[PDB]
Amino acid sequence: KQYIISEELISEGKWVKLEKTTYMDPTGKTRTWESVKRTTRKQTADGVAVIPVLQRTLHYECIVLVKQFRPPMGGYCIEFPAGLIDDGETPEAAALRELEEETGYKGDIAECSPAVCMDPGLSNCTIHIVTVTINGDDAENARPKPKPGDGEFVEVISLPKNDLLQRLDALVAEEHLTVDARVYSYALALKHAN
Amino acid sequence: KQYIISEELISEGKWVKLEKTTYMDPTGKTRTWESVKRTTRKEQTADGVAVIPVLQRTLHYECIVLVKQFRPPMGGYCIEFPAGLIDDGETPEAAALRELEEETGYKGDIAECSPAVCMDPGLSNCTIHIVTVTINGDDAENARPKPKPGDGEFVEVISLPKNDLLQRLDALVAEEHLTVDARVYSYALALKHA
Numbered sequence A: 001k002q003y004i005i006s007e008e009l010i011s012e013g014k015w016v017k018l019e020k021t022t023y024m025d026p027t028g029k030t031r032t033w034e035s036v037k038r039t040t041r042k043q044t045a046d047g048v049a050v051i052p053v054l055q056r057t058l059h060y061e062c063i064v065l066v067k068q069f070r071p072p073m074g075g076y077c078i079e080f081p082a083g084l085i086d087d088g089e090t091p092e093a094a095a096l097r098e099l100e101e102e103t104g105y106k107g108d109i110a111e112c113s114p115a116v117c118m119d120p121g122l123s124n125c126t127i128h129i130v131t132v133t134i135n136g137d138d139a140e141n142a143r144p145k146p147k148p149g150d151g152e153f154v155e156v157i158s159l160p161k162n163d164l165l166q167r168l169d170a171l172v173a174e175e176h177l178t179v180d181a182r183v184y185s186y187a188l189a190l191k192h193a194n
Numbered sequence B: 001k002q003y004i005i006s007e008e009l010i011s012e013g014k015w016v017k018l019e020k021t022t023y024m025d026p027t028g029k030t031r032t033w034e035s036v037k038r039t040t041r042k043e044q045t046a047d048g049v050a051v052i053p054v055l056q057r058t059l060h061y062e063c064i065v066l067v068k069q070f071r072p073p074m075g076g077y078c079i080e081f082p083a084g085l086i087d088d089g090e091t092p093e094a095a096a097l098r099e100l101e102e103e104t105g106y107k108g109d110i111a112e113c114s115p116a117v118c119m120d121p122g123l124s125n126c127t128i129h130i131v132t133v134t135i136n137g138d139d140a141e142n143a144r145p146k147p148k149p150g151d152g153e154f155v156e157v158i159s160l161p162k163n164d165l166l167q168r169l170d171a172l173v174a175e176e177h178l179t180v181d182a183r184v185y186s187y188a189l190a191l192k193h194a
């Protein structure tokens, strides 16, 4: 019933562009939408985000998160490890790779979502959410070695899965960070379950 | 350590703008980023809300109430939590209840309200409050819920059981071209993981 008629370029950066989308509304009237797209997509999706479950015997199961300065936000954010999928990379391989670079952990793939939208009223950005388990008792994850690329500066924050929401709220209150909406959504559902 | 040095406007549509962001990296070196912002944020503590609406009815399993609509940035239909921007002077809770009623017909009760969470913080400064609302589906008000969509709004309601949310989402993606939102998928994944 609704569909895109045309896309007009408004402005194109190196990494992001702004378009004016013309579309057919369900009444049969033509309407416009200002949209954002990345210039980097090739791929199943733009990026991956990793839900890393750190499993150590005789310890609570932790979710491994990252804290970074985010220039669009003007501040620090707490997020699932994540990055864009390299040209001709699978989402799983991007997931294990980004997890290693950002955290130093070597994980195993548990499951992989279909491409999911980030902010669909604003952009076409999509990611695969990849659930990964980390055997924290293996020697490779003893002294995990994070390999930041140029200009990446990432802090690792592991939080217990069984209290995640309350721990995130604490960091927000105490550290004036912004929690990521996907992280928060995950944390809410852990409390809402059953 | 890191902070914004300058924000230069590149292009300003009516709804969105693109900015060249200059910031100080933690080595003391000046770097740039291409940033997206909305033009609509005034004194709201966030751009928008998204509502987690838990529909509760005697002798029923709890449902999560979702909406499906065409998203011109995505060029297709998306399944999302009910959501909208916060009107000037409106509280996040009022916005949540109002959007829920407009989009679904249901009259909810506030349960909890998150702090401002970021939508896609490597791309944009956009933020939302995630507002959990219970819907008493045994109340007469909520028996024959009719969407009251605004101008150019065309929303379908999809209520799915909480106890099978992920598989029911998978079954919808399997049967048609449609993208699930990353917050909804994250929430459904945690419901499984718990």
Ligand SMILES: CCNC(=O)c1c[nH]nn1
Pocket: A032, A033, A034, A035, A121, A122, B015, B016, B038
């Ligand atoms: C910022 C994403 N664009 C919009 O919200 C919009 C609304 N009408 N036209 N474009």
Ligand SMILES: [Cl-]
Pocket: A053, A110, A131, A133, B193
């Ligand atoms: Cl798991």
Ligand SMILES: [Mg+2]
Pocket: A081, A082, A083, A102
């Ligand atoms: Mg990253």
Ligand SMILES: [Mg+2]
Pocket: A082, A083, A084, A149
């Ligand atoms: Mg990277």
Ligand SMILES: [Mg+2]
Pocket: B082, B083, B084, B099, B103
């Ligand atoms: Mg909406």
Ligand SMILES: [Mg+2]
Pocket: B083, B084, B099, B102, B103, B150, B153
């Ligand atoms: Mg609306």
